[PDB]
């Protein structure tokens, strides 16, 4: 693979906290969005060069957010943009038909109390799930643009919410070392995962505020079968690790892949399913996903227990966010040092798509 570190400042040297690739794009050239402490969300044009090197072309800047922006996401259709900042509001940008392209605010999802950390989307395109420092997860209807569901069972800061692609359950992790999984239809908590036993004492699955990063973004499988949760600790002293759960039972992980030293913080799965080249889940397809820890990026697939790729020693500060591309050719990583990096793969390097 190739890794290119952007040596130029994206947000006036301020740390970058969020990225997303335009899932609505179906070609080879990609569009990216970066969120920074400059109270701006910048949309860039990312394309591989003739030599195979990623090239970033600035397109537009969004300064509507009053304060620093933490999480920015796109809809599955790629036409609806959700931006979250330190103003405890969500801005909805649509196509408006120094900037090269025009972006316009359509909806203002007011109803957050504290800093927003993670924004989640729905497959149908009509539902929001958002997490904030308000110790609450809020679920919204796009067609109305207004709050419809509230989950206030978290006792500390929530740093991640994920929606099941099949559309049945939602997983939220907060700073209280509790993993709360709710049934969307019942609008009540269904599963609680906080303590786990090894060998016969039970200790906390997660670890408290010593993180220097601001995100614990756990992920659902694009098929929804598996839940991947970072920022876990296993007492073998304690070592950092990421746990894998299945839909069959959400309370206990059989397997965890560790990152001794620095703790994993962000996880993201590719939207492209590959043919098969220990296995967590056994179906004739496979999915490739990646985790950004404090100072490294790990790249696993469905079958291999050990990482398929390991990239280390790139950024000078804690990595903030990782985001996969539409076709899988790009992987954008941002740290809190004010600069970002890109992982580019050649054609079908991860595998043969389905």
């Amino acid at each position: 693979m190739k890794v290119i570190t952007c040596e130029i400042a994206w947000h006036n040297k301020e740390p970058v906290y969020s990225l997303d690739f335009q899932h609505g794009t179906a070609g080879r050239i990609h569009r990216l969005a970066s969120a920074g402490v400059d109270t701006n969300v910048r949309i860039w044009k990312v394309e591989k060069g003739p030599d195979g090197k990623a090239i970033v072309e600035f397109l537009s800047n969004l300064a509507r957010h009053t304060k620093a922006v933490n999480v920015v996401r796109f809809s599955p259709t790629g036409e609806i943009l959700a931006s979250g900042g330190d103003d405890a509001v969500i801005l909805l940008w649509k196509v408006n038909d120094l900037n090269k392209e025009n972006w316009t605010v359509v909806k203002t999802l007011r109803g957050h109390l504290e800093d927003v950390y993670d924004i989640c989307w729905a497959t149908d395109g009509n539902l929001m799930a958002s997490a904030s420092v308000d110790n609450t997860a809020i679920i919204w209807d796009v067609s109305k643009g207004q709050k419809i569901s509230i989950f206030n069972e978290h006792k500390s800061y929530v740093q991640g919410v994920t929606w099941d692609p099949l559309g049945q359950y939602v997983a939220t992790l907060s700073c209280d070392r509790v993993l709360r999984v709710y049934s969307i239809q019942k609008k009540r908590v269904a599963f609680n995962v906080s303590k786990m036993l090894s060998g016969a004492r039970s200790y906390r699955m997660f670890h408290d505020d010593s993180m220097k990063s601001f995100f614990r973004r756990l992920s659902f499988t694009p098929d929804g079968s598996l839940l991947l949760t970072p920022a876990g600790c296993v007492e073998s002293n304690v070592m950092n690790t990421t746990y894998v759960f299945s839909r069959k039972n959400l309370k206990r992980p059989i397997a965890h892949l560790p990152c001794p030293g620095k703790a994993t913080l962000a996880v993201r799965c590719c939207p492209v399913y590959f043919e098969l080249r220990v296995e967590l889940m056994s179906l004739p397809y496979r999915l490739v996903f990646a985790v950004a820890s404090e100072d490294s990026v790990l790249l696993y697939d469905t079958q291999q227990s050990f990482p398929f790729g390991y990239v280390s020693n790139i950024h000078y500060h804690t990595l903030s966010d990782i985001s996969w591309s539409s076709d899988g050719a790009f992987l954008a990583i941002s740290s809190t040092d004010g600069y970002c990096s890109f992982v580019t793969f050649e054609k079908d390097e991860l595998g043969i798509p389905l």
Partner: peptide, 20 residues
């Protein structure tokens, strides 16, 4: 020069850990 690790299905030195 920066160090990259690509797609392999030197990598053997970076195994993730379980706990028994």
């Amino acid at each position: 020069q920066p160090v990259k690790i690509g797609c392999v299905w030197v990598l053997q030195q970076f195994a993730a850990c379980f706990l028994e």
